[PDB]
Design an enzyme around this catalytic site. Sequence first.
Site, short mmCIF file in Angstrom:
data_model
loop_
_atom_site.label_atom_id
_atom_site.label_comp_id
_atom_site.label_asym_id
_atom_site.label_seq_id
_atom_site.Cartn_x
_atom_site.Cartn_y
_atom_site.Cartn_z
N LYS A 59 0.82 -1.20 0.00
CA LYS A 59 0.00 0.00 0.00
C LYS A 59 0.86 1.26 0.00
O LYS A 59 0.57 2.22 -0.72
CB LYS A 59 -0.93 -0.01 1.21
N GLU A 62 -4.12 5.92 13.23
CA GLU A 62 -3.80 4.62 12.66
C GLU A 62 -2.31 4.36 12.82
O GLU A 62 -1.52 4.80 11.98
CB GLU A 62 -4.22 4.59 11.20
N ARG A 63 -1.93 3.65 13.90
CA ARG A 63 -0.67 2.91 14.01
C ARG A 63 0.61 3.73 13.80
O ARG A 63 1.17 3.69 12.70
CB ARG A 63 -0.67 1.73 13.05
#
Lengths: 470, 470, 71, 56
Positions: A163, A189-190
């Site tokens: 991605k 997100e992370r």
Amino acid sequence: TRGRVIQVMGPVVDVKFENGHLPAIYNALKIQHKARNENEVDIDLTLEVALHLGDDTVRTIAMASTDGLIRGMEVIDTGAPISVPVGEVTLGRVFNVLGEPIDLEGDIPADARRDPIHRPAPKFEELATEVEILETGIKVVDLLAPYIKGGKIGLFGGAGVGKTVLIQELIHNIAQEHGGISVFAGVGERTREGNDLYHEMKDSGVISKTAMVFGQMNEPPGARMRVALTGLTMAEYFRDEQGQDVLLFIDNIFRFTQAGSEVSALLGRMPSAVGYQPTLATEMGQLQERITSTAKGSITSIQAIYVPADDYTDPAPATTFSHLDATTNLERKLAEMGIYPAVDPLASTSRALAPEIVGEEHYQVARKVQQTLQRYKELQDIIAILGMDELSDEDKLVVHRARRIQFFLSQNFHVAEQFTGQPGSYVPVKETVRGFKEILEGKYDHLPEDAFRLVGRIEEVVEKAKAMGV
Amino acid sequence: MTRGRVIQVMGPVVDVKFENGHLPAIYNALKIQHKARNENEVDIDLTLEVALHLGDDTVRTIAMASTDGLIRGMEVIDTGAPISVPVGEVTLGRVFNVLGEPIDLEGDIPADARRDPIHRPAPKFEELATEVEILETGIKVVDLLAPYIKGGKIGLFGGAGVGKTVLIQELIHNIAQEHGGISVFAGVGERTREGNDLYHEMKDSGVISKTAMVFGQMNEPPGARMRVALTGLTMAEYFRDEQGQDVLLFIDNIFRFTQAGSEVSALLGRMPSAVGYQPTLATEMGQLQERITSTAKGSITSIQAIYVPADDYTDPAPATTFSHLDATTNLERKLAEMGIYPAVDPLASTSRALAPEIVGEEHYQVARKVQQTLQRYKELQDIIAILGMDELSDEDKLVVHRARRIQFFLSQNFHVAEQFTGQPGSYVPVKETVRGFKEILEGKYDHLPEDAFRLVGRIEEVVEKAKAMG
Amino acid sequence: ALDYTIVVTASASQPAPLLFLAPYAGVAMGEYFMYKGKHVLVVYDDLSKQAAAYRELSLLLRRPPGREAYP
Amino acid sequence: LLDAKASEHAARMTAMKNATDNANELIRTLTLSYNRARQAAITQEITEIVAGANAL
């Protein structure tokens, strides 16, 4: 004109000003407090206004942690919403929610202009009349799921599929062919994956065109609200001033809605269906309708979407999907096969794949590629169990041309040059339509199963097959 | 004085405050007639039903029409009673809304007419009928296989072009012909153009002069649709109490009563029961359908349509309708395509009255033999489709040759279908159809063609039709 | 294995406030060594019981529930 | 051999007919359990929503 704190209820802080000196909704409030003794903690907070209560009292949402707040602390009114610096200063720099540089390259001086976070959407008078296709140079993207210029894209992919590499060559291709700045907005997100994505920005040289905004899972949900709007108001400067075709990457916009559902239960709202805030469609639309292509420039947006437990019926994925124009689904079974990019050709759809937009020839070639790849994903169990010798001499032609098409869907990337040594290619739409048309007609059946692997054009297939001896 | 004024308007719910000691009782009607004093007001003719006593001399009501235009402080008069709805010979051939006001365009009913209250307790244990007697309809599938009961509740499973309205209409004609009673059609919360079609069908068939029609459609509030079956039922109660006759009472889609009660409960602010239905589901269904009984002097029998939502017979609204149903008649489209009119499914239609203590021994044995032959014929259609008509058996060929004549003798010529086919129609007494099906089951009419049995009332009309055919 | 491990226990007889603060105490004991240069493994056995303890903690403080009454 | 091949095709026909009957019985029992789980799901979510509304 500077008021007291009444309540500190998790991330929600209630502030009371003097009569007649209330701030408007969405204005940024400041708490700058030095510890008077050893029983206190130094605090630097930014609160945004969310509601107006009864007696001069304002419910606010915090951007950082509220641990340490005393009832009665002085709150500074700025008279404006969250101002965020924009311009060429933001290129190559990593920002938080408040428009402050996370990295240690320096601080931005106060002379630069700062656009506010909250802005109305562009009007109906100002948009583009008909659909233009954002040309990427990626053969799966240009052929089977065409990106419109100004729309919204859904990446359905996890990790280990590629991605980030797809993101980086989108930035590189729009930077070298359209003159387009990209903006990456990491929404809850992370932090580790954002660090990996930033170091690969640094390695690929992609960082010099990208402005980056990070608010991850560690930050309270008001920060995870306003991250995507910070990245979007960085992209809107380049659109509305430079007239560019800007990319705007929002990683996991599901976090933008669930951060709102975390805040709204504490703001005092009745719960809506499935536990999501009641104002979910409007809070989604006030983000998604500022991502438009006007007459001056454009903002197209590739947006990763995490669907929880692959349930496509809960309201927050439904309202993210209702704003989407195309999806590109990143499949692990194509990444293990050696196909880079690992875009699933059959499952990735687009609103633009229609002959009024792409033309008749592109639509017919793309539809025939989808038909032969769907006919190939009906013989998979038969090939895997019963073998190749037993199928038919009419369906083995189908799997023949299907493998020749399925390996020609992969490219060499510009950002994969440092890993393999191969320079990478930008493939226009006409040449990839001509290449898949020539493979569908049967001109390249005598060339082997490789030499379609990781090449740009069909003349590169001819040159690589002559380099293989055939 | 009994005139108070509005304090709150929120959708269909209106709170009205009176003086102390002068509050209206629960379920009374409250009228709002307001002439607009200025250009800043709206003329209002609105009717409220009392639902609760909130305290502080206030009353929470539900509305029968739109509450748009109501002003806080607008006066509300107390009628001193629930919704007074006219009854008698002035209601026959007339169409009413939920307030007992004529929708029809001929004229309005004068104020000297007798008007009965909607909310009445069910008839007492002293007043009920001791025996179970059979409501003779003249329809052979009804009088033989699923017998109706005077005072019973009957479910129609059908609709969408199978013949529900024709069966409704022939039931009105037969009951008003032979038993001397009338019918009341209560269209509870259904489509307005279908109500128009049903009105014109009853108008041009001549059936409408012996029925009273009540419509509360979808455009009305849930407080109106909750009270439509009750305001048709209070018209039927006059004819079984003051006249003393056996009355039909049709409720098109009794499920709309349940979900309108659910919507009124959600507007009133009650905690919902399982599946979103009101807590008062079973007692609202009871307070409707315990007034549909057979008393000592008359009876109300009721043919009711049931939707069965999500095809679930364990859903609480079907599960509370079914505990009051005394018979079930099932309209099947495969019998309407075959040419059998009425399209009542002979094997799926069941009744509680089909038992030898009620109908007698001969009726019960003939009905069970008809059901066994039709069940064996359904078990033999797959053998006929597989093996063919030959080489099955001799006794099974006799069962097929018997059951086809039985299956086509179930159909009738209706008096409603006289205006479409010219055939005058027939009323078949229950002894005549028991003796006719017994003579078919004995084998007396095997030599006749099977098309002589189609659309024929008695067992002499079939041999006269066979003599006229050949 | 006790030459290098730290056991943090919050049993079921202890109040849900102590089950709520057990993973944060564990990760604070971990990050003490993490910000010194050491390498720490922190095993959180049944964080779903922390979710139940924080659900209890929020329902008794009269905070509005969500799905499955979790806050 | 021809008689055995005819009995082979007939036995496979009877076996697949019984397979369809077993599959349809499994369909109807699973739709009963589906309706039970559907009613339980809607009453659970409505209890959650009305409890959250009563919380305020």
